[PDB]
């Protein structure tokens, strides 16, 4: 249709004023003395939060320009960084700070692409830097202490999930389910987790929980493409005789088989559900007959064994205790099938992995035999009543993910305070130009932003605090919760550092293309 | 859509604007000598009425801002606060109070969380106070007297309160019925009583009553979950081949299940009604086996006994005289079945209580003894016209709510005196900061408004009548009625304790939730 | 409908403007450092590009005269000049350097046709100069290094890129297919591609692959036209007996025939497609014997042999592994058969090469012999995950492209640099009349646009990095991605020389149009 289009200072002044707005909503909602927002429920009652993430996918400016802005600044922050709330509060607020330091410096009239590079060579160094002084976690005594630490200084939760670590693993994977009791309770069963997620985005089985739950389904398995390919209707023949639900899995599903599955999912509400294939090649291949094996069930491809999706039966496909489906993610739970054969298929990939050596080899099949070998553990959490067990079990999941990614790289002041000590850093950079040298002064000037903000959410000066911590120890940081400044990391305020890094390159980059934009093309009212 | 945003003080201020027009509205129906509204109806003559909960409920205003803070103050004042009219009023009132004075002081420049801080001190003295000075009831007596005070000088009305009372026990399931006769009377019966509301919210069977009510129904008890499952049908050939009406108790219901009787509802409108199961886990199992027992059915889990929904018989499942169900509330009275199994499963409850020693454990075996040995009293209310058992019906329903009030946590003086009698107590209190100093003596000032209503509503000087009641005794008060000092507590003008606890609580929270807010987003019309 | 109509300048500028929208949104990208472009998109996130293509076809003016211009010039540059990215945006910024400059010319009183005859002039000599200038490459070391040049210094693809070129020749064809493995693969294989593309614009099989793909297919081939004609369904009874897929070339569909396989494909999606007749007359009849034979099918022309579309069989026609069509052009691989019918062909063709005289039969059966004698390259190229075979995939067709360009007509200095070096040769060039002059002098002024935006968008001063090259040897160019004064040739950076000849072509003859265009109409809104 017809376009609007704007080109450059123009076009980013009102890239800012849209993003700052975002900025501004998100702020607010940092730090352990985060303030409040209301949101508008034409419906219902209003929603009242403390949660940077939801503020975040809410807002949606009216302006064509501003609205662009935000959703560039929204979509980034939100996919690359999802696992920590913080972290995407603090990749929007370093991202609109950098932009808008960005936008002055060149509206002075200096060269925007030196700049970008000087900001670079900063975010570069500053990384560098976190690594560095990043001390690691590796042993259970630390990982109970981070687990209740991420329990605002819980104890049996960290416990149960230090409990968890050690009978499982680091890569091990772990789960959690409804105790309907009144302590949580640990359980490890054969689980076989894959990296691809659901296919269809309306297929949402749990509106509530975002995701994908199924329990005791017999599974399809077939090498080859069922995208478009009709004749699963004597799958659903059983799917609707036996009571028990069905999940795909093929090379991909497109047309009129996703067309036809979707819209019966939203019409009838049948309860069958398609994924991708978890590996690749021979390997693709190799992992297949693996949990075809596991599931009782076999690789419906045609070449080699002679099987089809013409033709269905219940003892051909395979039966499972439960699967679960998410976003890039999941599962399935107490597989059938011939023990023996389990037993011959270990042994398969033991002596694979014996005779081969290649480093990409081996370490496929030492993930092919964890997927198996090792369960899953899942964590029944009980208690009292069902609103109560439903709030514990969100408390339990946010501790395992923060410990889990804790434990993944590592860990490092809290509070906003991790940044402020990287500031040493870039004093070994040097400039080629003094466009870069402003780049480098603009992240030095952003580096304090999070520790401000977190300042005025608590409502004391932000500037006589940053110098004080600036001034201060490089193991004393300010405590918002108790308004001082303690020794933070045996008080227990820390963060994964991979949240750290996720933001700054988030923002980095998200703010770099915004301040190098120079054409927008919006379409005409 | 596009959304528009406003921020600090420029956004409270319309929140203010919305929530003063609500305050003002549903102020002068405080009290015994509160005005009249004049609601508006589009299609018949005007109501008038003189409750504080239906004019609340019912107003609405135009600009989002105002209409936000309008709707966010009347749902917690009213879904909180439902059982005496006057406490959603003073709530109401008590937080328009406080969020002005609070945001008048924030705009000179005060520190919101630390105002909020000195608000909660304050509030949580208060309520110290009151707890401390609140006299109880504990006898026949006195619950005569409450009763009696509650029915507005009926003595009848009173004494068959007590009567029911002292004959069930204070703790005890109550309820009315039409006496078809001139004079009210008594009768206690087997009984079934639960806390779990109607699941579907438009499922009521009398529009007049805003309860559903069934007689002489058949009853289906699943501890498995029937939400989303098909095959209700095998209930519904016996439900319209037998006159008499069905209902499930099961975990949950929703989806194909929850649609399929929705609509059924809106254009059958069959007679036939599913809940929640009040048990959990073990509880669960053991409650619905009760009542099972008591209606004569059975619990169709698949585990253990082999029943499923698919085949059912007249039999199979369990009989009840009558059913109501109502919010957070259903019951069953009159059930079926063996009365030698019912005292078997009295036994072995009461020799599951003694060999267990569990406090929990011990209470809910004692909560499921009561459960059946205790019945139901039904007070069957008579007179002449249909429209006077009505009058009566309302009357000994508002009589009955306020002394199971008053017994459930005791008696303090009425015409909102009370609070008043609290003042001194803040004197104890002392503040860290100045923001604490000025917080507290805002929940000073504020302790007063509900007498300025009261009097204002007599129409008498209101600052002269709370003058002269602070400068008097501890136990005389002002009375509207009489337009005189009075002394309230032989006088009979009193208000349950728990009442009052519960508005002071809340108003204290969304008065603190209003002045506190920072961000507010809306979409543009 | 009502029109509206403008003379001479009074139409010009309005279409100057309008084409001035599209050329800077165009000239940003343009270079390694182009900058980047915000395309909205009214469901998802906005898009962010840096490609000239895309933002071409994007934007739409709003005033019709603008529009017509932006239209017609986007047109023009894209679809006759679609190869390369950067020969559009070239092609689109000369144009409208030119045309400006015409038409500021024009204003003052300048003739538009000698105008435009010392355009045309101007053109032919640099053309001329510049394919004096160009120099060629033919070997396969120099295949290999300009491969590379193409891939961004990659090694690897250009050797596999040299090994299929060797194996397939100058004139053979290749393409590249998905290797499900971790490295790219070479072979050659049965291949039948002509020039013909897909009949049906709407027939885009892969919404995202811009294509038509189908696999182990069958054919239909009748020299007589089919359009508008039923009884195709007989094929169909086979089509959807066997899932096999169907193709289809006769002389031309449409009518009757087109707008129900149009309608069935829109809404059933049925596997058949019909193209066109590759050759003509005599040589269209040769053709589809040759590719019956290929295939093992057979002509359906009622003259001579009896056999009708109205009547299949499943033998009757020819089986070929792979269907492939796209714009221009369709593939068909692995054809079935007998072995010994293809060698008889080819015999037989090698006898009439050999008795036949007329160049354009002896090329004609050269042509046609190499269409079976020679097989088609194929690469699989491989890798980890499927997005990354994607990314190498695309790559490699670029390189495959970029490569095959500069190979068909040798290769000149990149960087926008070519150009300027026949700045000189409009020397000789002599004008009959001073109009002719002023179009020399207005080409000379735009020959150095391209090289002085590419600075620009690296940032540097235009006009110095021209006058120094123009003023520096002819070896010698300017190097946007390292910023300095570098030997082009074995610096890795230039460009094929028909890319430069088709944008200049294009561009030139536009803004003649543009220049010579006297009356303008346009629909009333």
């Known amino acids: 249709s017809a376009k609007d289009v704007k080109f450059g200072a123009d076009a980013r002044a009102l890239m800012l004023q849209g993003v700052d707005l975002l900025a501004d909503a998100v702020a607010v909602t ?49 996919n690359t960084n999802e696992e920590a709330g ?48 990043s001390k690691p976690v590796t042993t259970p005594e630390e990982i109970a202490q981070v687990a209740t630490i991420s329990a605002n200084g819980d104890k049996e939760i960290g416990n149960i999930i230090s409990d968890a670590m050690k009978k499982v693993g680091r890569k091990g994977v772990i789960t959690v389910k409804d105790g309907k009791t009144l302590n949580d309770e640990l359980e490890i069963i054969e689980g076989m987790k894959f990296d691809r997620g659901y296919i269809s985005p309306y297929f949402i089985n749990t509106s509530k929980g975002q995701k994908c739950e199924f329990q005791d389904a017999y599974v399809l398995l077939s090498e080859k493409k069922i995208s478009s390919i009709q004749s699963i209707v004597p799958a659903l023949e059983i799917a609707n005789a036996h009571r ?53 069930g076999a690789v419906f491809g045609e070449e080699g ?23 890039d993610d999941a599962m399935l739970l107490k597989g059938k099938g011939d023990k023996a054969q389990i037993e011959k298929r ?27 070998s090792d369960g899953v553990a899942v964590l029944k959490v009980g208690g009292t009543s069902d609103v109560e067990v439903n709030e514990k079990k969100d408390r339990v999941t946010d501790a395992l993910n923060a410990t889990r990614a804790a434990v ?3 860990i490092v002041l809290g509070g906003g305070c991790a940044l402020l000590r990287c500031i040493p850093a870039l004093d070994s950079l040097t400039p080629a130009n003094e466009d870069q040298k402003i780049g480098i002064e603009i992240i030095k000037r952003t580096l304090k932003i999070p ?38 990391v045996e008080k227990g305020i820390i963060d994964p550092t991979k949240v750290v890094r996720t933001a700054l390159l988030d923002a980095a980059g998200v703010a770099s293309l915004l301040t190098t934009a120079e054409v927008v093309v919006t379409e005409i009212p």
Chains 1, 2, 3 share one sequence.
């Open 346 to 372: 270990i042994q398969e990939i033991i002596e694979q992995l014996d005779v081969t050596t290649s480093e990409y080899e081996k370490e496929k099949l030492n993930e092919r035999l964890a997927k198996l």
């Open 30 to 78: 940092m730090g352990p003395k985060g303030r409040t927002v209301i949101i508008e429920q034409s419906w219902g009652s209003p929603k009242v939060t403390k949660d940077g993430v939801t503020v975040a996918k809410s807002i949606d400016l009216k302006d064509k320009y501003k609205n662009i802005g935000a959703k560039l600044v929204q979509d980034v922050a939100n």
């Open 408 to 410: 993944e790289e590592g």
């Open 305 to 327: 064994l002679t099987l089809n999706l013409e033709d269905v039966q219940p003892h051909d496909l395979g039966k499972v205790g439960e699967v679960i489906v998410t976003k």
């Open 244 to 296: 028990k639900p069905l999940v795909i899995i093929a090379e991909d599903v497109d047309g009129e088989a996703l067309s036809t599955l979707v819209l019966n999912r939203l019409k009838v509400g049948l309860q069958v559900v398609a994924v991708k294939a978890p590996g690749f090649g021979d390997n693709r291949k190799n992992q297949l007959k693996d949990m075809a094996i596991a599931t009782g």
């Open 451 to 488: 520790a401000m903000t977190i300042a005025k959410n608590a409502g004391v000066e932000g500037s006589l605090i940053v110098e004080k911590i600036m001034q201060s120890s490089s193991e004393v940081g300010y405590d918002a919760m108790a308004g001082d400044f303690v020794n933070m």
């Open 86 to 133: 913080d972290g995407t509060t603090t990749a929007t607020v370093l991202a609109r700070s950098i932009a808008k330091e960005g936008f002055e410096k060149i509206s002075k009239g200096a060269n925007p692409v030196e700049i970008r590079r000087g900001v670079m060579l900063a975010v570069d160094a500053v990384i560098a830097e976190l690594k560095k002084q």
